[PDB]
Design an enzyme around this catalytic site. Structure first.
Site, short mmCIF file in Angstrom:
data_model
loop_
_atom_site.label_atom_id
_atom_site.label_comp_id
_atom_site.label_asym_id
_atom_site.label_seq_id
_atom_site.Cartn_x
_atom_site.Cartn_y
_atom_site.Cartn_z
N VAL B 46 1.09 -1.16 -0.41
CA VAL B 46 -0.09 -0.18 -0.07
C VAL B 46 0.64 1.34 0.63
CG1 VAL B 46 -1.72 1.05 1.53
CG2 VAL B 46 -1.78 -0.67 1.47
N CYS B 47 1.64 1.42 0.54
CA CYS B 47 2.23 2.01 0.85
C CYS B 47 3.46 2.62 -0.43
CB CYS B 47 3.87 1.74 2.19
SG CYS B 47 3.24 1.84 3.80
N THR B 48 4.13 1.40 -0.96
CA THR B 48 4.58 1.38 -2.19
C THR B 48 4.09 2.52 -3.40
OG1 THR B 48 5.99 -0.17 -1.97
CG2 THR B 48 5.57 0.66 -4.64
#
Lengths: 201, 205
Positions: B46-48
């Site tokens: 998600v952070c990517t």
């Protein structure tokens, strides 16, 4: 109040009669909106959209309540203004929290918080906006669609996901035979940690 | 002292290593608006995607005079490798610093110790919005931009943005403003008094 905490139960008077939160919710998702005072312009427009999204909330099995410290007679008079000026009908309870019992219980003692509550009474999201800035109710539905989907399937919704967009397999699911079973639409390992799969239907 | 930040709290200053050099927050912001995005760990899907979209809105943040920082508990080397994966898999180029909070100093200071927080910081270093989302659910970068548009407008003029306001839509005169002479000065375009407390006025220039 932190995420994953139980949304504290209360009993309080409202625009639609005395309300016990947990009992009223039953197995539904909940959204509790707080408002600092009745007859405020931003809040007026927010209770407008909340009323207008009756069907959108119903589709998703979500019950909605508002909370203000002003009395029931104030709430009822304010509902008349909302219904008329926002071209709608407030269908949901506004809690009359005169004694501040519910406000203290939710640590609300200008800003206003919404609490998203799952069928097991867990706070799943807390969003606080300042008085300057009214909510975007599309975002509230999109987060609820995220939470409901990610509770039913081992996925997470990427940045700027909309209902129907592809999702990531959760990082903790690493069992390769389990992943094959759970995702028959197939998946792509873009990176060892970045696995994309079409939203499970 | 370290505590869960509240709106109107000063965003506390720090000095920390990053993907683009050792950074002192207040000095680095200057008089710009700031958005500090936290990320629990490098190499998380998600952070990517969030660092991807954040990098894609480079022009959009710069139009609004907004400086962007990411923050993660992981060394510079790890951040730089992750930026290579972000740049390639998200078809972008990360041009903002990812703070390397390897000693946890900035995370402990912002009391972030799985959720991720963004802080919107004004020119006087005040926190003006905090959004905490759980790991399941990616942020909506359209909303972060709309709230920046709201806060910037509502600092220069005496208005509030109603529910579902977009840039260029009607706004409401803040209740705190009740001097009708002052209102007449500030809003030459005029206004509709729908109710005494609901005064709609076209968005000022």
């Amino acid at each position: 109040l932190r995420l994953g905490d139980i949304a504290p139960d209360f009993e309080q008077d409202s625009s639609e009669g005395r309300i016990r939160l947990h009992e009223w919710l039953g197995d539904s998702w909940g959204v509790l909106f707080s408002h600092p005072a009745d007859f405020t312009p931003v809040c007026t427009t927010e209770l407008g959209f909340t009323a207008k999204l009756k069907d959108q909330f119903a589709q998703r099995g979500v019950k909605v309540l508002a909370l203000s410290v002003d009395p029931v007679d104030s709430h009822l008079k304010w509902i008349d203004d909302i219904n008329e000026t926002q071209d709608t009908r407030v269908n949901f309870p506004i809690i009359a929290d005169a004694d501040r019992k519910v406000s203290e219980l939710y640590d609300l003692i200008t800003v206003r918080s919404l609490f998203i509550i799952d069928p097991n009474k867990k706070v799943r999201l807390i969003i606080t906006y300042p008085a300057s800035t009214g909510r975007n109710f599309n975002e509230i539905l999109r987060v609820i669609d995220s939470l409901q989907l990610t509770d039913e399937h081992k996925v997470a919704t990427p940045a700027n996901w909309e209902d129907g967009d592809e999702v990531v397999i959760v990082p903790s699911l690493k069992d390769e035979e389990e992943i094959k079973r759970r995702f028959p639409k197939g998946y792509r390992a873009v990176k060892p940690y970045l696995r994309l799969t079409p939203q499970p239907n």
